[PDB]
Structure 1
Amino acid sequence: TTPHATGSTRQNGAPAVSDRQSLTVGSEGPIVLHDTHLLETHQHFNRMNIPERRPHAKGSGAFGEFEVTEDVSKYTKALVFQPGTKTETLLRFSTVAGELGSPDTWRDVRGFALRFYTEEGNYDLVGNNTPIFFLRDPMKFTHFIRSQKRLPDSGLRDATMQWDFWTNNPESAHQVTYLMGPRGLPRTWREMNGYGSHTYLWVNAQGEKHWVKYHFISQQGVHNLSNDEATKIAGENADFHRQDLFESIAKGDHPKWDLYIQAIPYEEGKTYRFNPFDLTKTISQKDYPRIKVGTLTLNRNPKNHFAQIESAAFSPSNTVPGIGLSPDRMLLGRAFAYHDAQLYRVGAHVNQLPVNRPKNAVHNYAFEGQMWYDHTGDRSTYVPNSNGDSWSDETGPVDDGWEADGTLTREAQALRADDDDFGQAGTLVREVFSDQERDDFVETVAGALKGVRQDVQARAFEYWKNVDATIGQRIEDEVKRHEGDGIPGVEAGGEARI
């Protein structure tokens, strides 16, 4: 308490006088220009909103801990995964297509973005609730996400646009099958699995390399909603998943996931019968079994959602020694894209915000810019220098690299022995799903096609028969009878759509 305090301050720390009445010429007069508290508070209010993420705008998260309980030191030198290591984490969950205020229970992919605050930097494993994705080249991703959003004239989501894109990009079949199956509607974020999806590189202390897949298996199980249930919840509680996570942690019910990897020897990655660098493919667990690493626990809610969750900036470029990227084109595009988006969304100094700062000392050659909170004093701005300010200069092949040879080209990845666009989707439908799941799948896909322009429907019938002839005919028969479920979040047809 200062001597002239009034209960709150302006931005300069001086007493504000009133948070409730403007400065006027008498009670009945106009507001004067020099009501600086009115101006400061309104100008700030007008700058509170920041661009929402594209994609994955709607989401929430929590802090936790990861504990290593197995010895995988023969596979990586990364500090975070050494025996017995416990690391603080942050996890943000999200949908993909919907905007900031959109219902949580729309049918969609869910994000699973996990940061480990390691002793050698922030390691981000930016995953999804599926082991695969719709595409295998990042040039197509902009198109895909735009097709999942809104028509340019009416501003409506449109299943015709969605199916036009999917049927003209048959590489999408594996993930469209997974999305249209049970797991398209998680009951809660606690009751879904997380995956890295991509192949990553692990490098051990001797320089030996393995290609790895990450799998986070929920200790709460996998539980899903029906289309009808999810539609009902979208109306009753648009923030159902956000509320569930916060309430669960507040009550002491800390959700857990066990991490397993698959580890492929370096040379076998080049010869395996499915392309491990193709994001539309899973790798068989009969060929490369899951190996346990440790357990993730979420146990602490945010104190401020905007500062800790909305302003968090995750990136697959945030690797640490012992972990690298891979020849997966999609992953390589992601190495550029996230940081770029965050410079616009948050700001140049996004990585100086507390939630994005690493625990270890940063000594980075970047200076100045807007909103530079932690300046470098008189440190040298160039290298080499004669002033004792260190720099890096390792020469030669990098520890997390690989070989390439060819001419500059734009073409599809070469096919391995068993690669195609529809086989793995067919295995999912025929061998993994139960009879009841298959029945529900038909009703979901048929519903998703209701009202779709007939030319696009016809292409969808061929697409589904390519996945499985029996399921495809069942879908076609139901579409021709105009049957099927309503799908939460999207429809087709009418004068405002294609």
Structure 2
Amino acid sequence: SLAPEDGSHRPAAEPTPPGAQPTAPGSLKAPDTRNEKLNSLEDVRKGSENYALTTNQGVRIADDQNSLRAGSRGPTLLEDFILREKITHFDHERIPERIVHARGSAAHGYFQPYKSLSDITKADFLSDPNKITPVFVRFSTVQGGAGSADTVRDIRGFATKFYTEEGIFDLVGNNTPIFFIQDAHKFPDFVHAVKPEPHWAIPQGQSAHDTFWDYVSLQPETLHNVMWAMSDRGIPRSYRTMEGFGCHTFRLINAEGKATFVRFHWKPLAGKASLVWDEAQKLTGRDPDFHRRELWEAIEAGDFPEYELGFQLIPEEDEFKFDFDLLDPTKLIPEELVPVQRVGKMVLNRNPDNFFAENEQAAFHPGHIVPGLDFTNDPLLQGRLFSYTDTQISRLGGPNFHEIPINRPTAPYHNFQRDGMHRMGIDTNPANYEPNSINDNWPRETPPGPKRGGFESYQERVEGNKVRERSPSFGEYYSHPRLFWLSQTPFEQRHIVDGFSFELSKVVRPYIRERVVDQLAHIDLTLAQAVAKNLGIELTDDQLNITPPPDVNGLKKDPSLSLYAIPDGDVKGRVVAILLNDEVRSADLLAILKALKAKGVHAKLLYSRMGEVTADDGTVLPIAATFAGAPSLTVDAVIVPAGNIADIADNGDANYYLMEAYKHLKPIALAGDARKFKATIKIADQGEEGIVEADSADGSFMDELLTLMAAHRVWSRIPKIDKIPA
């Protein structure tokens, strides 16, 4: 017995806030959270308590501390089969990482539609509001390895595996509504350009290098998703606070055989929020696991990630009614033109048990559709259909990857396929071919029908010659970048300029920077000039006269493209740093902690050391982390209670905590004599918007703080930080 007698090694099996208890496997943290998929995995879940340690062959091990040797200082013997099994398994633990989206964090949950969608699709999962579909979702970055950092500037993946009664449906989306390239044939060129360069394998998790910008400069189709990546969209606060999109026009197919074009949306019910660049970059160093950690802890805390599934629906007859081609994956469909219709709600409510087994081996692929859905001729989507099945053969070791437990359908599956590496299912069918008489032709084909029918493709008319040719309709590259730019707030536009400027400054060959600047001048002159100024580049008279691209169907902005133009803030699940001193005013802390609790906002009590401090009234205050150990990067706001301020007033880390949080536009609240820290961040006596201050933490001090937090960051402070040395 090595566990502590007080049982403090084991986390409570109840929802607890971030940092209160060690984290655990989902079935141990939340044993009563169930769904049909989680239940169906019970056959392979393996426990441990009270069991004897064995080899894989079930042989009990007596000494797991020593190899077998001739004499206690002698050579190890080949007949040590316990040593060799154990080391063999270790020696083969690793499998190939995903070619792209290798870095990803995942969770189980469930989806339910708001109402039946039978008028527009025969998809069984969308047929009845009382139909619950288990999901498994993996969020990811794109470029970096499985051991790269979470808060890089990159697109994010948002993949949802729906375990439906009529088969697996994978909705394999991203956090922007378009992609960099038009045709799947170029995907290796694009990916190679953004990935670490091949001579030296640098840089990790970054597009800020020559080959990416070289490619972008020579392939203007990429400019739209580049605008998105350079904006604060490229640096989300949390997977809970970004949008999701299905990237392509697909089809819905109803029982009557009518096709409707659809683009898929996920709206984050926690709101849209992003970091700022300096914060995101520094955070890759201070906690490269920050998003994986935040997702896991939100789920353990009961702050379940929730998203609303939405559809943009376009009738068959309206295929050609836009300025852009619906099948072009570099074009978005503005919500002002085609609204998103609410469809249903997904809640992620349980972490996995074993990350490797459930997360690393999960296979998602957009060809996994079900009756009631179908594809289109989008030439990016068309190639994806090839890639996601082929790649599993090396990644997951062969064609039986659907038998890896997380991948298994909960719907029945029976067919005539046999064998392959790792074959688990033992087929008893006397036949392995059809048609057969020896088993009366079972399992049998099923006609298409309104429910429970076989899959049949929509009979779309095809007419043309066999060509390798880009549609002329796809040859417009600047209008959507422009629409995106004009839709952003002035502070968002500033962060876009700064992303381009920062990234191009890492491009070693100056001609590439110049070429990119030329492309910016084809989108918007103010943008092009601002980036040019940061790069010491002067636009030519010609570049000054490039006429801007047309409006998109008469639109000059669409506010749904902004993260922040329309408020959607939610504070629940956010976190506040509380900077302790050695004699805190206990009435300030009561008021602070209860107000945060009442709104679902977490707190972490920080100090210059671990252990405890004692408040004015003798209350013993447990310390979560030190100032340097849990930097302001990791919180949404900072509160300093009154008390013995002289304890920390000269602590460099405590001052720096506030400068860093100030620079990154976070709300800061100072009570009583904590107002002496005003001088550290240079705040005028009469105060400033975004700094909450009062004699004490009572009255409106906490409501004012929470109002700031609902608006995420203090954008008005941007001109003030510009000269802060932090």
User: What's the TM-score bracket when you normalise by the shorter of the two chains?
Assistant: over 0.9
Q: Which amino acid aligns with 1:130?
A: T
SS in 1 for 2:344: strand
Bigger CA drift: 282-291 or 292-301?
282-291
Counterpart in the other structure of 1:465: 521
Counterpart in the other structure of 1:411: 469
Q: How does 1:44-443 map to 2 (within 5 A)?
A: 44-84=89-129, 85-157=131-203, 159-348=209-398, 349-387=400-438, 388=440, 389-392=442-445, 398-415=456-473, 420-430=476-486, 432-443=487-498
| TM-score, normalization by structure 2 | 0.64
SS in 2 for 1:407: coil
Q: Name the CA distance, whole Å, in 2 between partners of 1:29 and 1:401.
A: 75
SS in 1 for 2:229: helix
| TM-score, normalization by structure 1 | 0.92
Find 2:501's aligned residue among 427, 432, 446.
Answer: 446
Bigger CA drift: 150-159 or 45-54?
150-159
Q: Which amino acid aligns with 1:440?
A: H
Are the equivalent residues in 2 in contact too, given 1:203–1:399 (CA < 8 A)? no
Q: Which amino acid aligns with 2:218?
A: N
Aligned residues: 475
Counterpart in the other structure of 1:41: 86
Q: Name the CA distance, whole Å, in 2 between partners of 1:342 and 1:6.
A: 35
Counterpart in the other structure of 1:10: 55
TM-aligned CA deviation for residue 149 of structure 1 = 1.1
> 1:353-389 deviations in whole A, cap 9, x for unaligned?
1111111111122101111011212441111111222
SS in 2 for 1:405: coil
Q: Name the CA distance, whole Å, in 2 between partners of 1:204 and 1:351.
A: 28
Q: Name the CA distance, whole Å, in 2 between partners of 1:51 and 1:83.
A: 40
Q: Which amino acid aligns with 1:226?
A: V
Are the equivalent residues in 1 in contact too, given 2:415–2:443 (CA < 8 A)? no
- Percent sequence identity is 36
Q: Which amino acid aligns with 1:400?
A: Y
Counterpart in the other structure of 2:624: none
Counterpart in the other structure of 2:591: none
> 1:387-408 deviations in whole A, cap 9, x for unaligned?
2223438699944341211111
Counterpart in the other structure of 1:494: none
Q: Name the CA distance, whole Å, in 1 between partners of 2:127 and 2:319.
A: 24
Are the equivalent residues in 2 in contact too, given 1:367–1:375 (CA < 8 A)? no
Q: Name the CA distance, whole Å, in 2 between partners of 1:15 and 1:51.
A: 32
Q: Name the CA distance, whole Å, in 1 between partners of 2:110 and 2:299.
A: 13
Bigger CA drift: 171-180 or 450-459?
450-459
Q: CA-atom RMSD, angstroms?
A: 1.9
Are the equivalent residues in 2 in contact too, given 1:173–1:467 (CA < 8 A)? no
> 1:441-481 deviations in whole A, cap 9, x for unaligned?
11111111004211211110111111112211111111117
> 1:70-128 deviations in whole A, cap 9, x for unaligned?
33221100001113122111100000000011110110000000011100011100000
For structure 1, list consecutive stretches of 5 or more residues without a partner in the other structure: 483-498
Q: Name the CA distance, whole Å, in 1 between partners of 2:419 and 2:335.
A: 50
Change (3 A) 1:413 1:201: same
TM-aligned CA deviation for residue 288 of structure 1 = 2.0
Q: Name the CA distance, whole Å, in 2 between partners of 1:332 and 1:19.
A: 53
- By relative contact order (CA 8 Å, sep 6+), the higher-ranking structure is 1
Are the equivalent residues in 2 in contact too, given 1:70–1:292 (CA < 8 A)? no
TM-aligned CA deviation for residue 255 of structure 1 = 1.4
Counterpart in the other structure of 1:492: none
Bigger CA drift: 473-482 or 108-117?
473-482
Q: Name the CA distance, whole Å, in 1 between partners of 2:457 and 2:97.
A: 36
SS in 2 for 1:309: helix
TM-aligned CA deviation for residue 154 of structure 1 = 1.6
Q: Which amino acid aligns with 2:262?
A: V
Change (3 A) 1:74 1:407: same
Change (3 A) 1:83 1:51: same
Are the equivalent residues in 2 in contact too, given 1:174–1:421 (CA < 8 A)? yes
Q: Name the CA distance, whole Å, in 2 between partners of 1:48 and 1:164.
A: 38
TM-aligned CA deviation for residue 6 of structure 1 = 9.9
Q: Name the CA distance, whole Å, in 1 between partners of 2:62 and 2:455.
A: 64
SS in 2 for 1:295: strand
Q: Name the CA distance, whole Å, in 1 between partners of 2:363 and 2:444.
A: 26
Bigger CA drift: 473-482 or 456-465?
473-482
SS in 2 for 1:467: coil
Q: Which amino acid aligns with 1:392?
A: E
Change (3 A) 1:272 1:391: farther
Q: Name the CA distance, whole Å, in 1 between partners of 2:317 and 2:457.
A: 16
Bigger CA drift: 159-168 or 387-396?
387-396
Larger radius of gyration: 2
Are the equivalent residues in 2 in contact too, given 1:323–1:400 (CA < 8 A)? no
Bigger CA drift: 345-354 or 151-160?
151-160
Change (3 A) 1:6 1:284: closer
Change (3 A) 1:326 1:477: same
Q: Which amino acid aligns with 1:438?
A: Q
> 1:217-276 deviations in whole A, cap 9, x for unaligned?
101111101110011111111100000000110011111111110111123224543211
Change (3 A) 1:316 1:451: closer
Q: Which amino acid aligns with 2:268?
A: S
> 1:420-446 deviations in whole A, cap 9, x for unaligned?
10101101112x111111112111111
Q: Name the CA distance, whole Å, in 2 between partners of 1:189 and 1:265.
A: 32
SS in 2 for 1:403: coil
Q: Name the CA distance, whole Å, in 2 between partners of 1:397 and 1:265.
A: 22
Bigger CA drift: 292-301 or 394-403?
394-403
Q: Name the CA distance, whole Å, in 1 between partners of 2:415 and 2:359.
A: 25
Q: Name the CA distance, whole Å, in 1 between partners of 2:87 and 2:137.
A: 33
TM-aligned CA deviation for residue 131 of structure 1 = 0.7
Q: Which amino acid aligns with 1:27?
A: S
Q: Name the CA distance, whole Å, in 2 between partners of 1:139 and 1:379.
A: 43
Q: Name the CA distance, whole Å, in 2 between partners of 1:6 and 1:308.
A: 23
Q: Name the CA distance, whole Å, in 1 between partners of 2:481 and 2:357.
A: 40
Q: Name the CA distance, whole Å, in 1 between partners of 2:429 and 2:498.
A: 66
SS in 1 for 2:464: strand
